[PDB]
């Protein structure tokens, strides 16, 4: 039972989850009309 390893592993897991959450929270508008904010996105419109 290596307590130091367990503590560091748990802290790392929580920190990775926090980072992933913050990356996930970066969300631009996904509106089809809003072409300006999403100019680089590859979309095809059938209209």
């Amino acid at each position: 039972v290596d307590s130091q390893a367990e503590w560091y592993a748990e802290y790392d897991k929580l920190e990775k989850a926090r980072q992933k959450r913050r990356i996930w929270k970066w969300r631009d508008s996904d509106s089809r009309d809003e072409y300006a904010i999403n100019a680089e996105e590859p979309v095809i419109y059938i209209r």
Partner: protein, 71 residues
């Protein structure tokens, strides 16, 4: 729509398409910004639709003509 009544396209379709092309050229990250950059084209489309400037000009000419006639 954009289609004309008899054929072709609407009376002011080309002015609107000009404004849309200008907005497409612009690189502004928001639509509001692009409309601000392309406002002059919108003013041209509105001018063709209603002829408000020509109506004002005619009103001023008529009013001055009336003033000259009365004098």
């Amino acid at each position: 729509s954009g289609f004309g009544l008899q054929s072709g396209t609407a009376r002011c379709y080309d002015w609107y398409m000009d404004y849309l092309k200008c907005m497409d050229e612009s690189k502004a990250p928001m639509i509001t910004l692009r409309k601000q950059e392309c406002s002059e084209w919108l003013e041209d489309y509105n001018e063709c639709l209603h002829r408000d400037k020509l109506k004002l000009r005619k009103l001023l000419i008529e009013r001055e003509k009336n003033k000259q006639e009365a004098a």
